[PDB]
Amino acid sequence: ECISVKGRIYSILKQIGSGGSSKVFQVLNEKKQIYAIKYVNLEEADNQTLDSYRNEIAYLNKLQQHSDKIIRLYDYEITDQYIYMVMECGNIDLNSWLKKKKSIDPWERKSYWKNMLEAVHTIHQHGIVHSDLKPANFLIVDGMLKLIDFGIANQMQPDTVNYMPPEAIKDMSSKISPKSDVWSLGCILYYMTYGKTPFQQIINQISKLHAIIDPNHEIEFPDIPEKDLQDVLKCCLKRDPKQRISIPELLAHPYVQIQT
Ligand SMILES: Cc1cc(-c2cnn3c(NCCN4CCOCC4)cc(Oc4ccccc4)nc23)ccc1C(=O)NC1CC1
């Protein structure tokens, strides 16, 4: 099949992702340059969904300039029937790359952590809190991690509640701040370090949600060479968000600033 966007015509290689009424395709332009196109079918979309898609496109647009750790938006086309967004294609999403690697170079993990903090910090500066970060939200391209979305519109999945923060659960029934994203980033780094998510081994959602909120449930951190890392994990995974480390701090931390 093919897709046209503002004139230009693109050929579908395959479908790399899917969600409610939308699909992401890997595609090629005329000069055989590769891109990711998101297609949103708006035909039965409520005004809230409509507005959330409008808000994503606008934020994606504005944030272009502020970091190259945010996915590139080259062009889009929006009508009443559909959206098409032409964006950069990556090598692999971080959630897939994590299941395949299964022992991560410490240098690559540290570099990737910086990439994530910078992307997320960037959206925090424009008043966004993602609130649902997980490794699927990040994408490897060149040698760096880019943020794919902002938690604004429907989440897509590649063709998952380990990462939820305590404030969000105790929220019911706002306590959501930028710290909420630190928690989820905490969990992602934990996974890249210990090879699992802090509350992964717990068995059935409903119990795990109590654990996540329960102070007495001591979260455990095996000792490891890198103590900068160990400290980062501890600081991100504090349950009281007022005492949780912030992203500006994280960026000032030896784990990020100091190599070897
Ligand atoms: C959802 C989305 C996805 C990409 C994208 C761009 N490349 N890419 C890739 N890379 C290629 C992976 N593969 C395929 C087979 O092997 C060879 C290479 C995977 C992927 O997997 C996914 C798929 C879904 C969810 C997460 C991750 N999503 C994307 C860019 C933007 C958006 C998006 O709508 N953002 C919102 C507007 C703000």
Swiss-Prot record:
Record-annotated Protein kinase domain positions: 10-256
Keywords from the UniProt entry: Acetylation, ATP-binding, Kinase, Nucleotide-binding, Phosphoprotein, Serine/threonine-protein kinase, Transferase, Tyrosine-protein kinase
GO cellular component, one term: cytoplasm
A GO molecular function held by the record: protein tyrosine kinase activity
Binding site for ATP: I16, G17, S18, G19, G20, S21, S22, K23, V24, K38
Keyword Ion transport included in the entry's annotation: no
Coiled-coil intervals: none
Tissue-wise expression: Present in rapidly proliferating cell lines.
Active site annotation, chain numbering: D132
Keyword Iron carried by entry: no
A GO biological process held by the record: protein localization to kinetochore
Family: Belongs to the protein kinase superfamily. Ser/Thr protein kinase family.
Role summary: Involved in mitotic spindle assembly checkpoint signaling, a process that delays anaphase until chromosomes are bioriented on the spindle, and in the repair of incorrect mitotic kinetochore-spindle microtubule attachments. Phosphorylates MAD1L1 to promote the mitotic spindle assembly checkpoint. Phosphorylates CDCA8/Borealin leading to enhanced AURKB activity at the kinetochore. Phosphorylates SKA3 at 'Ser-34' leading to dissociation of the SKA complex from microtubules and destabilization of microtubule-kinetochore attachments. Phosphorylates KNL1, KNTC1 and autophosphorylates.
Self-association and partners: Interacts with TPR; the interactions occurs in a microtubule-independent manner. Interacts with MAD1L1 and MAD2L1.
Name under which the protein is recorded: Dual specificity protein kinase TTK
Gene that this polypeptide is encoded by: TTK
Portion of the full-length sequence here: 516 to 795 of 857
